[PDB]
Design a protein around this nucleic acid. Structure first.
Lengths: 316, 131, 316, 316, 131, 131, 131
DNA sequence: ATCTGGGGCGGGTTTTCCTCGAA
């Protein structure tokens, strides 16, 4: 697996939205329980949903996959990730619906040979013989650092006008600025591997032939999310992002690093990783760290310079 | 005395609403979950009332409803409104903010009263124009 | 794709307002999350909207397009940019509305021939068959540099009078000074190319013929923003702009340089450019640097003298 | 589009004021972001309003217009530049209100003939059908140059007592002295040209006839600001002045000279004009200079000795 | 006069229900256990009626049922309804709120009447469409 | 003691406002986001009060409201105002500036109190002129 | 120690102002934008204080405010004033000039303190004469 | 340090979709 935590610093953006009321746009906000010096409080804070990141990652994956020659579906050729869920998608793509449970593996392999996205991003088909394939990448909402007593965030509204020569044309847009942090998970040991239980069916040899390329492309795709390329309303409200701190870990066993809330989550997560290996008897456990805010790190750990070097080393 | 303070705050909110023709400050007050939101509305509504005072569009008066009652006359967009009662004192604002620091419920109570005052006055003014 | 970051210095300025309270005109301000030795702070600072620069860019584009013989719309002939939002604009321009989804492409091409602005700036038509076209240039607010422990910006009010001989006339105007910065993006590999999916329709040959002229005009248009010709209230509050540092980059793959917050942002983007090319398998990456404040630059990158040279180089 | 910049030297002056406190008249002061050898600092410095120069220029324009056959409005015949904003001025001058947008153009032409000032300086009318006309002259504040690490400006209070034989008379006035600079602009390609768009109406022929005369008057007007005649409180505080450097340029495309912040700012603007004549297709670019301080100039620049020569040449 | 006030409040609730096609405000009114819940519904229903007035979808009229009776025409989703009677005055709202401060029973009485008015009108409108 | 300091600063701001007939210094004080803005207003208001003292238009007095209370008489444009309370000491200004260096909230609190004092006095003065 | 130096400079400015009956030197000090203006005022105020010392119209004393505090008695135009505190030493002037060479802000701080001392003393002296 | 002025007006959002299946 590859698991990581990242800390961002965004100013004057409006990335995710929700239904509008009147002539005012709405920025997604959620409740959070925070620990203070006097107890526990409930606050409301802006949040960027977890599916915008998924869409950005899958779009980057589609681009790179088409570039490097891996099979890509028809509907997913355009960026319409309905995937092979509804009968219309199957009819357009040209696949017969499964008959009984015994046909599930055939259907899964046939779908997985036609669309990299349906492989490295999971999919679901609902019908007489339901078929599932859980995602190989996992993401969650992007919350600001719940540190101390003062949440470092702020949300305001702005006034805009559409000028005209024959008045007979006014709107308000929400804008935010926060210190965002989020965590991500991936597992390369399950790509190009049918999930359903059955008997080997022809074509899996080709699946085994392309496994290295598929894994390489999936690892490359993360650079989009890590570099700050996602969210809507980017035409006129291009944000000003910057990377403060990042921890990434490659292992052989389940492992989740500390959230990026507290000031010191690097030293704590490295110390935890040092012992988790012995606890669960693994064989590989490596940690990479990027530090721009000068927080406590530790000793005897990698210190990269950018995200490109991190992606290169993960590829190697 | 708590009810009298809440009633005087409700009169201030109703005067500000009738003068500005905007419910936005009363909506913010009745939905407040913090002392920050309440205090911001108490400033902004008094700032609106201050402009009406400087323009002589908001004035204190007495009205016979056979004893004289204190009232506030409000002129807005050629409409004339009269709110019966006193505006809050500085001490009423301070005591009300202390009540809010204990329980934000009192902002909802004042907002509900303010909207009731404004609705009754707007209904009466529309009926007289139709007659 | 041409991306860039720019650092301007502005004194005794008011290029945007929001509303007025009493007899006072309000400048636009917004929150920002800032980092200092102690920690994270929230500050209110004057900003210039992102729709006060798109308008200037589109106006310069209209002027140049008219001067060079390219087509220009009817409403957009005057500096009104409703484009084709509502049915009235279509009726005045003289186009028919889309019938169903299948015909959508047709309509777009027509709209994309009459008016150049509707091509490089994108548009949206809302009807029984909605049509969309995202912009080809992206912009964001103009914030001052969040560097160090002291934001170098100031805001104040000024008192003004209107003379008269029969008194029976006083106004307050906000004025700001700042070290502004921002960034911009333009993708010339999609200009004069339909963005809707469908079968070929007649008239695309003219688009193919005019592609070169359209791209050249669009590239030339940026000189407006880069020179410093934008904003409102310029008649009596003409500002005093000055260019300090500028970095622009032409590539074949998605890429964004560092914001202009830190003194050392020229070096980091140049260093990251080559590694990004290597990881993403690019085939072209060039960078141009204009420097007058005397900060670290790097090596193996061109050094120009004036903005006018950069436009020529980009056109070449 | 006659543009240019100018530098002035003054001593012991008070050419503007703001709300006074007590018995001490307050000279206007504003904040500025300054660059030094160490970083960007904030300073407070005396300045002179931009509207005062506009008023002085308009007054001189009226004075020279009444000296010839050009018309002048009743209200503006006396120096009260209210133009036609309020309805009282309309009633006094005897012009019907604009009925609807279809009539709007008419109104403008009718207003544009009676008063030359309302034409050259633009105006505004607010009502059911608002009408606008942007000014054909633009100006900004008069700041001291930010050259070097030291601002060459000083301010200081003064003391004055009124004699009296029966005491029962003391006042203080601020005085400043600084090396001032400022840039101006005037676009002669639109004088006497209606701005509102619509069907032509009677009287435009008369407008066309006098276009040359109006342009000549507007060009002549600038001698008022170039010489130095402007500002209040000159009856006792008469400030010594001595021109130091000037640059004036005539073109056919948008262009703005370099602010007078450097010992060598003529060379940069000359080079930029030479390089920009080609970037935007143009057919005219002329520059002039009046140098009296021995700064770097360059070559191929017409040199004069008095502002009268510059005015005559521009008229030619 | 108490019954006339309750009847005019019931007409307001019935007009708001027929225009909004939602029983939620009448449900809240008939289940109210406090003056807060009653007053909130009285505002929200009048706010719905205000939108219908501004859209000209709610209007006062007279109808011959052989004398002319006051009525309110309501247009909603292409359906036309007519409620017979007057809407409450500002004084009726104030006197009704005083009745509620004594006994919240009057909110249940007004809610029961409002639902009866709305049900009879909806039944008649469905029958005419079936014929 | 913090509330007493804030109250004395509010009295200074109210005296300066009533004497100058300008809200500008109170507006600057209540909108302050830095110690610079607060300190500048504290100087400018005291400079206005100093002119009123030198002209004998601002004077300390006692008033019976049956015990004597400290007050400040202000004469402006032929209007007479009386602010009840003390003006701040040099120590109150210094302790208030230390409170501002910890939290600029105290400037907003003092501004809100000052505007309340001034509004109540202006309302009472206009009512007596109308009678 | 920086605050003690500023306080002693403020006492010198207040003594010079009360003795000369002129604010001009304090105005020049608080508006200074250069070390030249500050140094010129520091000389001119000490030259005024030197004349008051030679005339025995300025003298150091102790006053019980129940411990003895250092003070400066000033006699001017038949008025008696007492400033509580020490005058600056030669080292305080030198250290203050070094503070001004770093930041002219300290001249504004000393000027604000000096005017506060003088205003409080002038107010107290006028009140005792009225009683 | 004595006065007098303390803002006016047009605009205050349009569309597309409102859950699929196995138990």
């Amino acid at each position: 697996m590859i698991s990581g935590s990242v800390r961002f610093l965004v100013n004057l953006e409006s990335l995710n939205g929700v239904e509008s009321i009147g002539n005012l746009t709405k920025h997604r906000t959620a409740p959070v329980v925070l620990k203070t010096s006097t107890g526990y409080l409930v606050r409301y804070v802006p949040v960027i949903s977890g599916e915008a990141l998924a869409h950005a990652y899958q779009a980057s994956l589609v681009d790179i996959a088409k570039k490097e020659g891996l099979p890509v579906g028809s509907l997913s050729s355009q960026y319409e990730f309905i995937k092979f869920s509804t009968d219309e998608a199957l009819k357009i793509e040209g696949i017969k619906e499964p008959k009984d449970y015994n046909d599930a593996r055939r259907f899964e392999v046939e779908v997985m040979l036609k669309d990299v996205i349906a492989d490295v991003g999971g999919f679901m088909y609902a019908g007489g013989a339901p078929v599932r394939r859980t995602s190989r990448i996992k993401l969650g909402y992007m919350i600001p650092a719940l540190r101390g007593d003062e949440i470092p965030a702020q949300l305001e509204a702005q006034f805009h006008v559409r000028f005209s020569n024959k008045p007979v044309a006014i709107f308000n847009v929400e804008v935010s600025s926060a210190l965002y942090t989020f965590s991500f998970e991936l597992d390369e040991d399950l790509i190009a591997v049918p999930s359903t239980f059955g008997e080997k069916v022809k074509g899996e040899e080709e699946l085994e032939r392309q496994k290295a390329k598929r894994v390489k492309s999936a690892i490359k795709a993360l650079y989009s999310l890590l570099s700050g390329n996602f969210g809507g309303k980017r035409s006129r409200f291009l944000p000003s992002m910057k990377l403060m701190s990042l921890v990434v870990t490659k292992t052989d066993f389940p492992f989740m690093p500390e959230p990026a809330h507290d000031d010191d989550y690097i030293k704590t997560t490295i110390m935890r990783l040092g012992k988790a290996k012995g606890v669960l008897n693994g064989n590989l456990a490596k940690a990479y760290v990027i530090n721009n805010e000068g927080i406590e790190v530790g000793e005897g750990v990698t210190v990269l310079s950018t995200v490109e070097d991190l992606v290169v080393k993960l590829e190697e | 005395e708590k009810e009298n303070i809440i009633g005087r705050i409700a009169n201030l909110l109703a005067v500000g609403f009738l003068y500005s023709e905007s419910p936005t400050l009363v909506d913010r007050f009745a939905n407040a979950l913090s002392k920050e939101a309440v205090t911001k509305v108490l400033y902004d509504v008094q700032r609106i009332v201050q402009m009406g005072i400087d323009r002589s569009e908001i004035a204190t008066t007495t009205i016979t409803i056979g004893k004289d009652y204190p009232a506030v006359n409000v002129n807005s967009s050629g409409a004339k409104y009269t709110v019966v009662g006193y505006l809050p004192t500085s001490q009423d604002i301070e005591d009300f903010l202390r009540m809010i620091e204990e329980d934000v419920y009192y902002a909802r109570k004042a907002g509900a009263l303010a909207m009731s005052i404004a609705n009754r006055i707007k209904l009466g003014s529309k009926q007289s124009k139709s007659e």
